[PDB]
Amino acid sequence: NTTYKNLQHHDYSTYTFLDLNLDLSKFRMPQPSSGRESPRH
Amino acid sequence: KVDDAKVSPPKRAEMKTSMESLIHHFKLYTEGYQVPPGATYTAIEAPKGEFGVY
Amino acid sequence: RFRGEHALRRYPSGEERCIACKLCEAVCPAQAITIEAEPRADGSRRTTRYDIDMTKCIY
Amino acid sequence: ALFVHRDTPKNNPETPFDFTPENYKRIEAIVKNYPEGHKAAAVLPVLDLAQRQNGWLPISAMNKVAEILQVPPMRVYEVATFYTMYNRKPVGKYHIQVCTTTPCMLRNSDSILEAIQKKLGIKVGETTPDKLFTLIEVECLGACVNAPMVQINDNYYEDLTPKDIEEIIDELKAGKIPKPGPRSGRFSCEPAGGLTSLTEPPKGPGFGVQAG
Amino acid sequence: KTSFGSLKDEDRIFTNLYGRHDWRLKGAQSRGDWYKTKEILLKGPDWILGEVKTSGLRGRGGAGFPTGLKWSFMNKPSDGRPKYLVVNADEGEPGTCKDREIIRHDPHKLVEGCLVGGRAMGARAAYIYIRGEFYNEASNLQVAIREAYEAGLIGKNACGSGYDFDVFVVRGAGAYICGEETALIESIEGKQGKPRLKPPFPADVGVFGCPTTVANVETVAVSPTICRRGGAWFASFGRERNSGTKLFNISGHVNNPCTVEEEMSVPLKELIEKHAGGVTGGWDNLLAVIPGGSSTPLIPKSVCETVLMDFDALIQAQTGLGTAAVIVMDRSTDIVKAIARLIEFYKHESCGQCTPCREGVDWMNKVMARFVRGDARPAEIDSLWEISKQIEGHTICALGDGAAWPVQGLIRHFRPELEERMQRFAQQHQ
Amino acid sequence: PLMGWASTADPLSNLVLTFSTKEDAIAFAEKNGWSYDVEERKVPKPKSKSYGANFSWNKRTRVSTK
Amino acid sequence: SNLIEVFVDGQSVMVEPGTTVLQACEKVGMQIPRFCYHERLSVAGNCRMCLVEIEKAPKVVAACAMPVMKGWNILTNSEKTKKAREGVMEFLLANHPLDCPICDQGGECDLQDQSMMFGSDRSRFLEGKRAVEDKNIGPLVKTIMTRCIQCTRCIRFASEIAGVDDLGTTGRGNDMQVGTYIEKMFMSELSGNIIDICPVGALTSKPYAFTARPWETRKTESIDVMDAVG
Numbered sequence A: 001n002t003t004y005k006n007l008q009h010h011d012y013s014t015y016t017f018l019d020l021n022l023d024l025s026k027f028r029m030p031q032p033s034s035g036r037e038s039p040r041h
Numbered sequence B: 001k002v003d004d005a006k007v008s009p010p011k012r013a014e015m016k017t018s019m020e021s022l023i024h025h026f027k028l029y030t031e032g033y034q035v036p037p038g039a040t041y042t043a044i045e046a047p048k049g050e051f052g053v054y
Numbered sequence C: 001r002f003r004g005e006h007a008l009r010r011y012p013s014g015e016e017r018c019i020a021c022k023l024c025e026a027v028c029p030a031q032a033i034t035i036e037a038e039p040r041a042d043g044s045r046r047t048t049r050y051d052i053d054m055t056k057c058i059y
Numbered sequence D: 001a002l003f004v005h006r007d008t009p010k011n012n013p014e015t016p017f018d019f020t021p022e023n024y025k026r027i028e029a030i031v032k033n034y035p036e037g038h039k040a041a042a043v044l045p046v047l048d049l050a051q052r053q054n055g056w057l058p059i060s061a062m063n064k065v066a067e068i069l070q071v072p073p074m075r076v077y078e079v080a081t082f083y084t085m086y087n088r089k090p091v092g093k094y095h096i097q098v099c100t101t102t103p104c105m106l107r108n109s110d111s112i113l114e115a116i117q118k119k120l121g122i123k124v125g126e127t128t129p130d131k132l133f134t135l136i137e138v139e140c141l142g143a144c145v146n147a148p149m150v151q152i153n154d155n156y157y158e159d160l161t162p163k164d165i166e167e168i169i170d171e172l173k174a175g176k177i178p179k180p181g182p183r184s185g186r187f188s189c190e191p192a193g194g195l196t197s198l199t200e201p202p203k204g205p206g207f208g209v210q211a212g
Numbered sequence E: 001k002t003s004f005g006s007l008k009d010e011d012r013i014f015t016n017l018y019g020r021h022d023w024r025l026k027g028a029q030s031r032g033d034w035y036k037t038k039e040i041l042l043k044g045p046d047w048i049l050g051e052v053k054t055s056g057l058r059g060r061g062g063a064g065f066p067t068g069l070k071w072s073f074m075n076k077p078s079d080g081r082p083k084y085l086v087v088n089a090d091e092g093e094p095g096t097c098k099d100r101e102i103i104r105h106d107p108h109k110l111v112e113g114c115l116v117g118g119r120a121m122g123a124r125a126a127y128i129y130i131r132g133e134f135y136n137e138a139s140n141l142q143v144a145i146r147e148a149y150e151a152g153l154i155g156k157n158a159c160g161s162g163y164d165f166d167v168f169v170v171r172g173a174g175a176y177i178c179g180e181e182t183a184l185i186e187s188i189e190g191k192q193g194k195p196r197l198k199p200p201f202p203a204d205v206g207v208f209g210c211p212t213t214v215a216n217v218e219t220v221a222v223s224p225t226i227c228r229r230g231g232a233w234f235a236s237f238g239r240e241r242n243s244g245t246k247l248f249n250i251s252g253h254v255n256n257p258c259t260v261e262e263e264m265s266v267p268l269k270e271l272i273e274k275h276a277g278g279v280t281g282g283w284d285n286l287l288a289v290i291p292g293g294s295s296t297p298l299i300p301k302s303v304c305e306t307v308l309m310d311f312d313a314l315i316q317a318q319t320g321l322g323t324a325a326v327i328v329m330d331r332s333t334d335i336v337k338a339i340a341r342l343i344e345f346y347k348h349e350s351c352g353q354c355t356p357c358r359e360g361v362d363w364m365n366k367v368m369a370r371f372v373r374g375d376a377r378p379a380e381i382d383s384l385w386e387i388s389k390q391i392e393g394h395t396i397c398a399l400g401d402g403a404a405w406p407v408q409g410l411i412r413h414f415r416p417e418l419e420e421r422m423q424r425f426a427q428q429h430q
Numbered sequence F: 001p002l003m004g005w006a007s008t009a010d011p012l013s014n015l016v017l018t019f020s021t022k023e024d025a026i027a028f029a030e031k032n033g034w035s036y037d038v039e040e041r042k043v044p045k046p047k048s049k050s051y052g053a054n055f056s057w058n059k060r061t062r063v064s065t066k
Numbered sequence G: 001s002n003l004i005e006v007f008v009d010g011q012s013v014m015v016e017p018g019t020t021v022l023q024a025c026e027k028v029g030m031q032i033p034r035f036c037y038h039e040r041l042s043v044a045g046n047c048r049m050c051l052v053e054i055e056k057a058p059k060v061v062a063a064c065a066m067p068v069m070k071g072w073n074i075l076t077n078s079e080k081t082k083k084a085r086e087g088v089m090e091f092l093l094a095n096h097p098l099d100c101p102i103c104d105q106g107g108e109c110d111l112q113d114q115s116m117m118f119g120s121d122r123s124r125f126l127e128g129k130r131a132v133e134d135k136n137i138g139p140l141v142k143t144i145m146t147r148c149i150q151c152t153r154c155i156r157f158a159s160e161i162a163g164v165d166d167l168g169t170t171g172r173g174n175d176m177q178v179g180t181y182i183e184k185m186f187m188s189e190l191s192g193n194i195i196d197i198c199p200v201g202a203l204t205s206k207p208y209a210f211t212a213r214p215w216e217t218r219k220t221e222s223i224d225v226m227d228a229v230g
């Protein structure tokens, strides 16, 4: 076999990374805190 | 002179044109060269005789 | 190399050669140098009063 | 070079700056990945989004980020000056980055720079009096086994030659964006001659496992 | 024993490096990932650690430090703070082509290995730093993690087990210094990427105040294959200590430059002449070899004709064997100008925490430019040898050291050619 | 009034004496008679500093730039 | 229990846990030459002059922030200690221009004292010497950023104790400017404390600037006025 099995890479636009990052928001651990919301509140 | 710009203020090209000799020149004329402690003596044969300095 | 007049120089078509860096007052063996210094507003650093005691100069 | 701001309007806030509420939802995903206590850790992805939204970032973009991310603005200035993506100065729509340091120049980057220079006309490290053809030369990208290589915004161009340089430049002058893949064989990381690496179709999950 | 081993098929670590059969969760399933895996993951993590230390896995990424002992110190009992696994994905030391292709074609074995490492030491999630120059392969990785999450495979209660694990990927703002260990830590933080002090470890205090660990793509990708195979199989290739497999990747002055997987020990000349064509113009055409990366001194022809490719052999060659830039160079070319281009790379990429790397790299750049023009005296060139000895062991990160060492190799080997350039300019002004 | 100097009628304004302990100072001042004001010697304070608490997890010590 | 023994040049002394090598050396009296440490500021291992050799160690430990483990022995005056100090002093003195007369810290420099008592005397790297143009910080400070050795003492003190959060590092390599990027007039409280904490003549007093020099002035007792803190 000498056949290329990407070209799913071809159709990539600009915002697609954060598009996917929004697409994969849920089923996520509860983001453990460090006391407050920030070291300066 | 000696091979020490920490005691002898070095010559002009390295004094100017160089940073380390400018620094040693400056602090050598202001502070004076540091001297280790102690009490010494010497004496030479001056034409008057035993010139001693303590 | 004869050491007489204690005169000043200046730059080629230029300003006054001194800086008021006080090295001469720092090393003068009679404290015959007295340099009271202020900068002028032009940015180039200057003096007020440059003083040599010709009485006190050991040359 | 030139790390004084030198205000000169098109800067000096208020310069009008904005995002999309859809991009605000992107920013909510961005500060949804990071845990509580370190809300300021998303400075790098949010300012990456700012370069994605505007081809060069002005001062009011940094001011808007300093509003949003509860950050002191000087750290935003530091990260904007520090790295290499964030061209705070205006460039073309497409931006040309010629990667050439150690393997690339040792594999004849001279003809590549010649072809770019006497094809585009403007010089290295400079701009052009139009868009989409502003050029700098750059350090390594990673694809070292190929020719001294070309990068445009989020695309590569690998394994070239000065006539293919001129052809891809002419296609960009026509606006027809070329293929993202390389030219002249080895579409993947191939030994382009004998191909003495793996050839057989692999076993997969077939071989011997231990203590199942 | 063998003749220090050679690659025979089915002992390759992973196929489909370049363009081949499949790329999907179905593709990794057909290639042997997510196979017999959860029973191993629930068998006990210290068994996995014993498998890793049985393999004798030498540390990747140019470090060479034992990964098994590192993760065994990372088997500390828990605190009131999480534990993070960080994966470096930068191809520095130009000449590299290390894992751009790995992240383009096999992401899911990295998913395997990072799940194994996260469950292996009580970790909780994995941050994966990619070079930001790789947006297409980055979105490919994003689609792969999308399919992996959406297949009900990992996430909270990965494979429905009693263990949660997630992977977050951070794009690069663009820096070779972010390829380092602790400058990566402050690049994640939101600061500028600059390291910290070493006796407070990132294994002690890493990502914001948690004991984390940082590993190469290669260690993570080779990890679950050893966990699914038998013990000491990686310790059965070539020598004993420096054993197993490695990417021998050659760019530069060779016919059809490329990348191969091989075993750990191989003759260099036969490695070159059998895999990527040969040497351009024959074996007697060339002049020298830089193995070990851009952080490594050069090797001349008369030595490299017989030196077998091994860690201990290149320690005896007094060179720092990193990874994947194991290339050659020809004879008629300005190696002075090429090494000067490498010093230009070093000056364009270093932070300014430590004074001496900044100062020494600028001095070496200006003085090597003078040596390209050939203007100075040989006392100055021996002074450059002196200061290239003097810079080393005075920094935070090893970039100053990797700037010092090629100057050392060039001075140790190509001294009369430098004398020739100086004589050229002396007779030119004369 | 002619040169602009520090014309002073103070012979004793240019002395400084180097001592080892405070007892030597008290004995010397009572030996040579004139009055003395002795200030107390104020040493520095050995203060605890630590890089880990400089870069900890949930405290307020966070330099945010280095 | 609560006592850790270190052998400064053989001599044993008791050191509390959690403290640096430098507090032990000051406990026995040794001033390690230092530029970026401060005894009231947070510690960051930048200046590299704090190097010292502990035996059976190939690397050289930066003793500005090195913690003290069990039972040490330290060579303060080893040969490579002197080599490392001469080397770091040799590195610092290239990109610092010839300004010691027109500077304002003539008797009060730090490069000068430690270059006398630790460094070499015949410089190398005969050309180079980058020049960085300053900013307009404010009316209170005269600012020559060319003499800035980038020791990062103003930034740490500013952002922690002043909290003004405006001194920024811009760039990399030789081009690393300290200060606010957009030339904001640095006007805040305690903005006059910085002119002395800057260990080199990068920052100085605006009214005092070209008037006098510390070897002339005598030093005299006084207590703070207009404020009841003293």
Ligand SMILES: Cc1cc2nc3c(=O)[nH]c(=O)nc-3n(C[C@H](O)[C@H](O)[C@H](O)COP(=O)(O)O)c2cc1C
Residues within 6 Å of the ligand: E058, E059, E060, E061, E062, E063, E064, E065, E066, E067, E070, E088, E089, E090, E091, E092, E093, E179, E180, E181, E214, E215, E216, E217, E219, E397, E398, E399, E402
């Ligand atoms: C100057 C410098 C450059 C580095 N470059 C890389 C690099 O290109 N790739 C990489 O994976 N790690 C790089 N590292 C990090 C180390 O190689 C690190 O040990 C590695 O990520 C994991 O090593 P390990 O095999 O012991 O886990 C670099 C470190 C330094 C100090």
Ligand code: SF4
Residues within 6 Å of the ligand: C017, C018, C019, C020, C021, C022, C023, C024, C025, C035
């Ligand atoms: S103060 Fe004295 S030494 Fe300095 S520049 Fe003026 S005349 Fe020369």
Ligand code: SF4
Residues within 6 Å of the ligand: E177, E194, E195, E350, E351, E352, E353, E354, E355, E357, E358, E395, E396, E397, E398, E399, E400
């Ligand atoms: S050696 Fe240079 S690049 Fe590395 S941490 Fe120190 S200052 Fe930064």
Ligand code: SF4
Residues within 6 Å of the ligand: G096, G097, G098, G099, G100, G103, G104, G105, G106, G109, G110, G111, G112, G147, G199, G200, G201, G202
């Ligand atoms: S700060 Fe610089 S110019 Fe000023 S006295 Fe020191 S070395 Fe000289």
Ligand code: SF4
Residues within 6 Å of the ligand: G147, G148, G149, G150, G151, G152, G153, G154, G155, G178, G197, G198, G199, G200, G202, G203
């Ligand atoms: S301005 Fe002064 S205190 Fe600040 S980094 Fe520069 S030399 Fe240090």
Ligand code: FES
Residues within 6 Å of the ligand: D099, D100, D101, D102, D103, D104, D139, D140, D141, D142, D143, D144, D145, D148, D149, E094, E095, E096
């Ligand atoms: S140097 Fe051009 S790709 Fe690495």
Ligand code: FES
Residues within 6 Å of the ligand: G034, G035, G036, G037, G044, G045, G046, G047, G048, G049, G050, G062, G063, G064, G065
């Ligand atoms: S004090 Fe400057 S580095 Fe330790």
